[PDB]
Amino acid sequence: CELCCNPGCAGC
């Protein structure tokens, strides 16, 4: 998620 690797990541 630090790379916004999935659209469900909080913050992305």
1-12 in b/e form (b: 16+ CB < 10 A) is eeeeeeeeeeee
HSE-CB of 2 using CA atoms within 13 angstroms = 0
The structure tokens listed for 1 are: 């998620």
Q: Where are the alpha helices (DSSP H) in the chain?
A: none
Helix, strand, coil share of the chain (percent; to 5): 0, 0, 100
Residue pair 1/12 in contact by the 8 Å Cβ criterion: yes
Amino acid identity at 11: G
Residue pair 11/1 in contact by the 8 Å Cβ criterion: yes
Experimental resolution (Å) = 0.9
